[PDB]
PDB file of N, CA and C and ligand atoms in Angstrom:
ATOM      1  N   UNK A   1      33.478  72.059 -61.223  1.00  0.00           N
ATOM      2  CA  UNK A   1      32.089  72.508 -61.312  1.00  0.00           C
ATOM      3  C   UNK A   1      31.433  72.067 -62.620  1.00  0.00           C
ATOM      4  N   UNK A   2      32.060  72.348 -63.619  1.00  0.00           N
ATOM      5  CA  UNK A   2      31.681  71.822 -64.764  1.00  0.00           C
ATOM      6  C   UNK A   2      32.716  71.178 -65.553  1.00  0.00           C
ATOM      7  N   UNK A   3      32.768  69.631 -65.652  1.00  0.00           N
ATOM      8  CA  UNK A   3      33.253  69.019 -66.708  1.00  0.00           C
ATOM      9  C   UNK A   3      34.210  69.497 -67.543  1.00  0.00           C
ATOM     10  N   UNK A   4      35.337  69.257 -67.667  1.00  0.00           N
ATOM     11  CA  UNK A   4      36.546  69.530 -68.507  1.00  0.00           C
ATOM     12  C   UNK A   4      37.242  69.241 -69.484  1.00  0.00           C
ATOM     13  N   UNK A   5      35.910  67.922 -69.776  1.00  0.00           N
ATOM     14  CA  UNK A   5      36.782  67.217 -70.496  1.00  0.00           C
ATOM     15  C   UNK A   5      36.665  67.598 -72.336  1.00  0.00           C
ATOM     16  N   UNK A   6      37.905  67.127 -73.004  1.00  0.00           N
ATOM     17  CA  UNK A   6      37.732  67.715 -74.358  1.00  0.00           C
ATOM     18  C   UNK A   6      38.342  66.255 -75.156  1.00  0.00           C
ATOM     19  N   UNK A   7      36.968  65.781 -76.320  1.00  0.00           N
ATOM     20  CA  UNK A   7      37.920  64.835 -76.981  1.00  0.00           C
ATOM     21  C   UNK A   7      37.169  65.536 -78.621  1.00  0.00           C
ATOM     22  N   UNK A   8      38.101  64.419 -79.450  1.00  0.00           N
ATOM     23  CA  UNK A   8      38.313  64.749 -80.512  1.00  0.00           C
ATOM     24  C   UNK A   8      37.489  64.266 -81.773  1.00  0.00           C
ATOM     25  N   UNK A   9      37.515  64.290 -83.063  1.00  0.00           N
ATOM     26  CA  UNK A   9      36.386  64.187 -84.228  1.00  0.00           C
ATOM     27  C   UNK A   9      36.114  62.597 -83.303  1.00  0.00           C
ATOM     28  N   UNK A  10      37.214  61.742 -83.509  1.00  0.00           N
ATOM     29  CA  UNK A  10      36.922  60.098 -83.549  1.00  0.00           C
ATOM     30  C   UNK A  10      36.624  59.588 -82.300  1.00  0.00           C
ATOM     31  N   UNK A  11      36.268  60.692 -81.403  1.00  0.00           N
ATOM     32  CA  UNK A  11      35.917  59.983 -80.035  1.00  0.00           C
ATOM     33  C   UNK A  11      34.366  60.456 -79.574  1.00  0.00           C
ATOM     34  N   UNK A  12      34.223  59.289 -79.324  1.00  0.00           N
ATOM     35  CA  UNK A  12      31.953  59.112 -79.340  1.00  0.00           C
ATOM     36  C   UNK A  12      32.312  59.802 -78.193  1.00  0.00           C
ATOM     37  N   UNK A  13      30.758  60.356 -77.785  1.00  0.00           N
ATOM     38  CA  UNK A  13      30.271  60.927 -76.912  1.00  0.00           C
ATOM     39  C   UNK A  13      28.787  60.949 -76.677  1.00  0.00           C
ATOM     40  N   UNK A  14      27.849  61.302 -75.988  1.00  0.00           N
ATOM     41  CA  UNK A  14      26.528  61.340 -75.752  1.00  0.00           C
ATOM     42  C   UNK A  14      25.550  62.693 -76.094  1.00  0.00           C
ATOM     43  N   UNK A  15      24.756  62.522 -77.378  1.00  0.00           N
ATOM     44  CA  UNK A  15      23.839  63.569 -77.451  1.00  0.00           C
ATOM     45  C   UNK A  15      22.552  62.995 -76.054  1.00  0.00           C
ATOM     46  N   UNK A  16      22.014  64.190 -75.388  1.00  0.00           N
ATOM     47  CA  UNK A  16      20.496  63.299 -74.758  1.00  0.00           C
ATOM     48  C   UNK A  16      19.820  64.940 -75.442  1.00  0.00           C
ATOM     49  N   UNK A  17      18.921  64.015 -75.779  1.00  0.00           N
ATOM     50  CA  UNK A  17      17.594  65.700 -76.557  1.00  0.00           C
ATOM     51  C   UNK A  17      16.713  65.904 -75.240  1.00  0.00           C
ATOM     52  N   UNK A  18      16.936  64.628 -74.016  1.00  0.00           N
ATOM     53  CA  UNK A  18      15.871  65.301 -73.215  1.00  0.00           C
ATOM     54  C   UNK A  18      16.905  66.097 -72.240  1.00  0.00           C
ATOM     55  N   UNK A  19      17.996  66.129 -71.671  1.00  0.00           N
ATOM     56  CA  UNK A  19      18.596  67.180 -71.247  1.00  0.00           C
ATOM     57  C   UNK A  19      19.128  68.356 -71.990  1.00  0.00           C
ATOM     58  N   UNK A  20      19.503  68.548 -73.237  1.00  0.00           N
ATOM     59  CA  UNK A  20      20.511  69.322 -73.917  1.00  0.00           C
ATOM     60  C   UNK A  20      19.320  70.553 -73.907  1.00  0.00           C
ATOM     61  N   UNK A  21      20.051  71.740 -73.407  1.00  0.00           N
ATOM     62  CA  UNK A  21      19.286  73.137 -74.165  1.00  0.00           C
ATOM     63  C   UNK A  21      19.432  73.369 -75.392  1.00  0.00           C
ATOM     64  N   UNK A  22      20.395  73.019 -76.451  1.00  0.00           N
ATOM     65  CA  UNK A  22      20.407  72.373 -77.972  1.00  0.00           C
ATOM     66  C   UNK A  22      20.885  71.580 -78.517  1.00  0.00           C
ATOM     67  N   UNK A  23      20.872  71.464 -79.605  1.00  0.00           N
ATOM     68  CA  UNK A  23      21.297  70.184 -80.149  1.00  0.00           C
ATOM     69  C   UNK A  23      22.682  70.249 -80.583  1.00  0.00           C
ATOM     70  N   UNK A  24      23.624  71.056 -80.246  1.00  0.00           N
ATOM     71  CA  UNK A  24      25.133  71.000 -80.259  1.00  0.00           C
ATOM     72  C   UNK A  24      25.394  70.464 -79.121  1.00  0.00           C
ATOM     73  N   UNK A  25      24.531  70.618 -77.605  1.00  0.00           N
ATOM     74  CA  UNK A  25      25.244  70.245 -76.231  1.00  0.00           C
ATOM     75  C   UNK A  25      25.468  68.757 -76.392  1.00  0.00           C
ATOM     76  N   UNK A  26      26.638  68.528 -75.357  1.00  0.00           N
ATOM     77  CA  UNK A  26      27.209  66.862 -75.523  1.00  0.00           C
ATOM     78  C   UNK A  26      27.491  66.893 -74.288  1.00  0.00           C
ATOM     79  N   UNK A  27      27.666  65.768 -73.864  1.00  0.00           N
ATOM     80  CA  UNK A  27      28.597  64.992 -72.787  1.00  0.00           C
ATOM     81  C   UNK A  27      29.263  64.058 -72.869  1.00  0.00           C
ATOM     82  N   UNK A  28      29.862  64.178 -72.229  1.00  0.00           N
ATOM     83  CA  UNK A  28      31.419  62.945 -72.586  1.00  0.00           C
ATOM     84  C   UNK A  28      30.555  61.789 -72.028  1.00  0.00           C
ATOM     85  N   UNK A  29      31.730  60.426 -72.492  1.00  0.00           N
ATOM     86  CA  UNK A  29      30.948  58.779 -71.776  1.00  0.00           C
ATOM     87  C   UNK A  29      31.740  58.826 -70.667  1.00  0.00           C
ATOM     88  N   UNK A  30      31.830  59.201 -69.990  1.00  0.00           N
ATOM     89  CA  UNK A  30      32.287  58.763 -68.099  1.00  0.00           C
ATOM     90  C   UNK A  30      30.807  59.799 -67.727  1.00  0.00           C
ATOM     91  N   UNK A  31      30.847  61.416 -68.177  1.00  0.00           N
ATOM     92  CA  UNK A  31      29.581  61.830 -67.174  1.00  0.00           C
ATOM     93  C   UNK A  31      28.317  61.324 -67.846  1.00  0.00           C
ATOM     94  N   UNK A  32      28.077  60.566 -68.929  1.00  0.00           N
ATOM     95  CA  UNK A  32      27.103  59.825 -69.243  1.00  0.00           C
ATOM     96  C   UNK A  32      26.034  58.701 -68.227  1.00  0.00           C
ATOM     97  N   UNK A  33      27.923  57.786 -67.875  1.00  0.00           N
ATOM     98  CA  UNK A  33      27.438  56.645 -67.383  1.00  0.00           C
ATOM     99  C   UNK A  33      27.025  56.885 -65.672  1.00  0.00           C
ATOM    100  N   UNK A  34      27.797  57.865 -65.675  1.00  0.00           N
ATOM    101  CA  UNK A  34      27.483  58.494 -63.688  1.00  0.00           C
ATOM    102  C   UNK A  34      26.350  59.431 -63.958  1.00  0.00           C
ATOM    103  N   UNK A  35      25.585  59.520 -64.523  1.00  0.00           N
ATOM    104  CA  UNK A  35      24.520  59.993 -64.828  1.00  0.00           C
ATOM    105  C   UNK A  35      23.559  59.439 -64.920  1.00  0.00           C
ATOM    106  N   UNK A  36      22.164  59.937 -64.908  1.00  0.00           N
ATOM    107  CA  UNK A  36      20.326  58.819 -64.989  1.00  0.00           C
ATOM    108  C   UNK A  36      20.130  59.460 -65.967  1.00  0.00           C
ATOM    109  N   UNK A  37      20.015  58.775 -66.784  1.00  0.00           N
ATOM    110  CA  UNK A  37      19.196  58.988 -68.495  1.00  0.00           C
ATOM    111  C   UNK A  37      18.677  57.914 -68.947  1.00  0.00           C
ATOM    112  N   UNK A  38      17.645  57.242 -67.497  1.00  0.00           N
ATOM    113  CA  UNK A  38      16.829  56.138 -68.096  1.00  0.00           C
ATOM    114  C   UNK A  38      15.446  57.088 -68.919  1.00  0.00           C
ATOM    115  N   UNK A  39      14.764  56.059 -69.735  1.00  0.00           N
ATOM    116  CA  UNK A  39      13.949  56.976 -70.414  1.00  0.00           C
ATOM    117  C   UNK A  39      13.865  58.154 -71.770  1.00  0.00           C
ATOM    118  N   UNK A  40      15.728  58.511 -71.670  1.00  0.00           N
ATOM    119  CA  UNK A  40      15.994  59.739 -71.842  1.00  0.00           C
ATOM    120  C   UNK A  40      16.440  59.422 -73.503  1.00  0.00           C
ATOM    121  N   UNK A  41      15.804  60.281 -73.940  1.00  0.00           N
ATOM    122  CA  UNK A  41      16.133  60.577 -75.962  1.00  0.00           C
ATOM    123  C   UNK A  41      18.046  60.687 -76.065  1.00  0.00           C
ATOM    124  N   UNK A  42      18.381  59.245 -75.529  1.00  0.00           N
ATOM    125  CA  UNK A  42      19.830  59.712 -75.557  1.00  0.00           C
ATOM    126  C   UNK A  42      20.551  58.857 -76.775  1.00  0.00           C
ATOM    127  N   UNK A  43      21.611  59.388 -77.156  1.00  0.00           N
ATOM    128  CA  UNK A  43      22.451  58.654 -78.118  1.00  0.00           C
ATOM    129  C   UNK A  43      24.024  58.691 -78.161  1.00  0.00           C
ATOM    130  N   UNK A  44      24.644  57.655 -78.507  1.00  0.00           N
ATOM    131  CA  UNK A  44      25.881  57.421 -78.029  1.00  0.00           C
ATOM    132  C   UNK A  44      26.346  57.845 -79.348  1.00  0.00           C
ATOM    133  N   UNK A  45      27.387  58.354 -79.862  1.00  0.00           N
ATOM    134  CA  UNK A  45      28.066  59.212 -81.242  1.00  0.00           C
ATOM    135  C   UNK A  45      29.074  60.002 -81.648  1.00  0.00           C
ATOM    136  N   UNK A  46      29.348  60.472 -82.827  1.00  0.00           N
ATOM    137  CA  UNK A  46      30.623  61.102 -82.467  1.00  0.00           C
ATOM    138  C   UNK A  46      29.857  62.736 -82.763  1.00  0.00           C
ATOM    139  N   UNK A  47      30.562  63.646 -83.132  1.00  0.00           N
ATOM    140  CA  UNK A  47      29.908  65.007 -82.679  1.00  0.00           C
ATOM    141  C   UNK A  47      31.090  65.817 -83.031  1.00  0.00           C
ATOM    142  N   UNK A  48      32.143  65.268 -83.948  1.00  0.00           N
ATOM    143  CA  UNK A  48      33.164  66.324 -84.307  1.00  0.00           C
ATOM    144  C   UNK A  48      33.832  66.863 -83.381  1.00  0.00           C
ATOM    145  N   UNK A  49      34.058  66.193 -82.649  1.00  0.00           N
ATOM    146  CA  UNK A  49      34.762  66.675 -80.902  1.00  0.00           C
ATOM    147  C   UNK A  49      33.576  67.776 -80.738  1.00  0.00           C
ATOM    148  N   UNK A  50      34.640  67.822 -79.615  1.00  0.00           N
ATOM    149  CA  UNK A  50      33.705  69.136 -78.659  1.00  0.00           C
ATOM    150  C   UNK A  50      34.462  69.091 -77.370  1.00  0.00           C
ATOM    151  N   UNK A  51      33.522  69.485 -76.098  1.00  0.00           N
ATOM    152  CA  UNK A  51      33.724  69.586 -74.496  1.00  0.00           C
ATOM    153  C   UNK A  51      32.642  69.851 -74.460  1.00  0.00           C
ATOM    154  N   UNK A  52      32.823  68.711 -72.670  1.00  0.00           N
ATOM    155  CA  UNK A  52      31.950  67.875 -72.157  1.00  0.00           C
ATOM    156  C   UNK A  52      30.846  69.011 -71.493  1.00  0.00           C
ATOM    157  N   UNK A  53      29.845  69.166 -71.726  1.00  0.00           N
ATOM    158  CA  UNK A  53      28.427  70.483 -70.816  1.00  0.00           C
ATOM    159  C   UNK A  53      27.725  69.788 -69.511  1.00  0.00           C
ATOM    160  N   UNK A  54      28.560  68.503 -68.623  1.00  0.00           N
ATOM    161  CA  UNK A  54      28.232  68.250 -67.291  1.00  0.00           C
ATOM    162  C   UNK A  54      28.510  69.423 -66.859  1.00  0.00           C
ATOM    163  N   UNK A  55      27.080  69.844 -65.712  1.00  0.00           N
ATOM    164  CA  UNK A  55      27.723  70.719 -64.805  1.00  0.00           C
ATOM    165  C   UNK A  55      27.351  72.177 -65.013  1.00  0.00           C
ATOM    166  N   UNK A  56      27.170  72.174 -66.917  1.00  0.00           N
ATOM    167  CA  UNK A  56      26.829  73.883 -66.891  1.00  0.00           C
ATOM    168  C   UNK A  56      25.371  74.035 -66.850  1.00  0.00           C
ATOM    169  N   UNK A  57      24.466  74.591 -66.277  1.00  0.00           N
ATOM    170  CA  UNK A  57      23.246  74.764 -66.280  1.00  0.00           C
ATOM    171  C   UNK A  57      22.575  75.733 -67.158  1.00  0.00           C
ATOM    172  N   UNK A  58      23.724  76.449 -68.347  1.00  0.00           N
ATOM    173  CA  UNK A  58      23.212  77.035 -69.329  1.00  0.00           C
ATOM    174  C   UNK A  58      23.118  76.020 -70.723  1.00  0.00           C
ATOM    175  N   UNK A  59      23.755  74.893 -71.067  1.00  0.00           N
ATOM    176  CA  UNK A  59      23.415  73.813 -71.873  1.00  0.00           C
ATOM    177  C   UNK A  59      22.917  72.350 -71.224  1.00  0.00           C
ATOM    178  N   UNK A  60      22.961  72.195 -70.142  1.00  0.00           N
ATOM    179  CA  UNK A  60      22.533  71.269 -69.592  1.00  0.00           C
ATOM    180  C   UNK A  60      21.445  70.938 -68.531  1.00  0.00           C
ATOM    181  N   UNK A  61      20.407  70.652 -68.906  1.00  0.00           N
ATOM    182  CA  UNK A  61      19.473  70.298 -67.309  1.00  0.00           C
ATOM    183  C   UNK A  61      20.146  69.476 -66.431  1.00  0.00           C
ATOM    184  N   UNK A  62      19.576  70.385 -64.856  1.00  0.00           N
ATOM    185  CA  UNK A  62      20.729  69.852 -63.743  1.00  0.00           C
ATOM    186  C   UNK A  62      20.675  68.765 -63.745  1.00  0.00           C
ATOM    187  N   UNK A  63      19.255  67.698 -63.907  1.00  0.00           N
ATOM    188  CA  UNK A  63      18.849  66.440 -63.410  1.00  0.00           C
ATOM    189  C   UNK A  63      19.614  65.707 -64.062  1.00  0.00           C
ATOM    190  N   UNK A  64      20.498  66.042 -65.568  1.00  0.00           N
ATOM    191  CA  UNK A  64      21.264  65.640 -66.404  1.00  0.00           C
ATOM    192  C   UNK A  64      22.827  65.071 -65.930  1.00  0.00           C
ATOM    193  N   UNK A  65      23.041  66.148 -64.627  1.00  0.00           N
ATOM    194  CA  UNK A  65      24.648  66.047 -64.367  1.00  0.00           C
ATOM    195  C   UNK A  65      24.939  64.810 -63.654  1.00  0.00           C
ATOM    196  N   UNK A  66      25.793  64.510 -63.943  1.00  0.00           N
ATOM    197  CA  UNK A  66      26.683  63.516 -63.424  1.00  0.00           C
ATOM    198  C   UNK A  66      27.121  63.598 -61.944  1.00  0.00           C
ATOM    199  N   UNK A  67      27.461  62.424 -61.271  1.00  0.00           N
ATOM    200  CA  UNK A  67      27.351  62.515 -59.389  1.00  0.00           C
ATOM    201  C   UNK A  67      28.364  63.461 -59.134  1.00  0.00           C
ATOM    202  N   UNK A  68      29.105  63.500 -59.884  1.00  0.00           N
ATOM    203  CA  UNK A  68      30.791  63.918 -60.036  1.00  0.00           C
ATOM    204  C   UNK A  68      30.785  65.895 -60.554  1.00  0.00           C
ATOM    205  N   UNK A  69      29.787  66.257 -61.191  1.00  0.00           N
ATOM    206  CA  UNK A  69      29.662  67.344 -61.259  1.00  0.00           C
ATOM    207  C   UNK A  69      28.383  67.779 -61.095  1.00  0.00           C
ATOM    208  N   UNK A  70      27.708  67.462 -59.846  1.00  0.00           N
ATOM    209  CA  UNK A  70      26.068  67.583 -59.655  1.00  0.00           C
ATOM    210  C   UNK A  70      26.486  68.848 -58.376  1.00  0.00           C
TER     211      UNK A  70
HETATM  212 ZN1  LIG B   1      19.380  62.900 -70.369  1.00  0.00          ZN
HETATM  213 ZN1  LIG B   2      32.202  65.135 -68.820  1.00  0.00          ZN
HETATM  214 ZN1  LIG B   3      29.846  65.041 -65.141  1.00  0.00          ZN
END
């Protein structure tokens, strides 16, 4: 349902400011790329690890999720 994934300080990941409900939410690069964020205030980066917010609709706009957790 929602994304599981967890990586670490040295592994990039995706801020988008036009989906995130703040600016801590991330998504990993696999639900990035299965995702539409043409247009979208997005950036590829690292983020001090974390886990991935495909899928949750309390940090993420749905239009945001990935095919795989839509
Ligand atoms: Zn986006
Ligand atoms: Zn993910
Ligand atoms: Zn996903």
């Amino acid at each position: 349902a929602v994304c599981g994934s967890v990586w670490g300080q040295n592994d990039l990941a995706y801020r988008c400011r036009t989906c995130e409900h703040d600016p801590t939410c991330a998504i990993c690069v696999p639900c990035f790329q299965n995702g539409n964020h043409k247009d979208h205030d997005y950036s590829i980066m690292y983020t001090g690890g974390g886990c991935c917010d495909c899928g949750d609709t309390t940090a993420w706009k749905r239009e945001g999720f990935c095919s795989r957790h839509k």
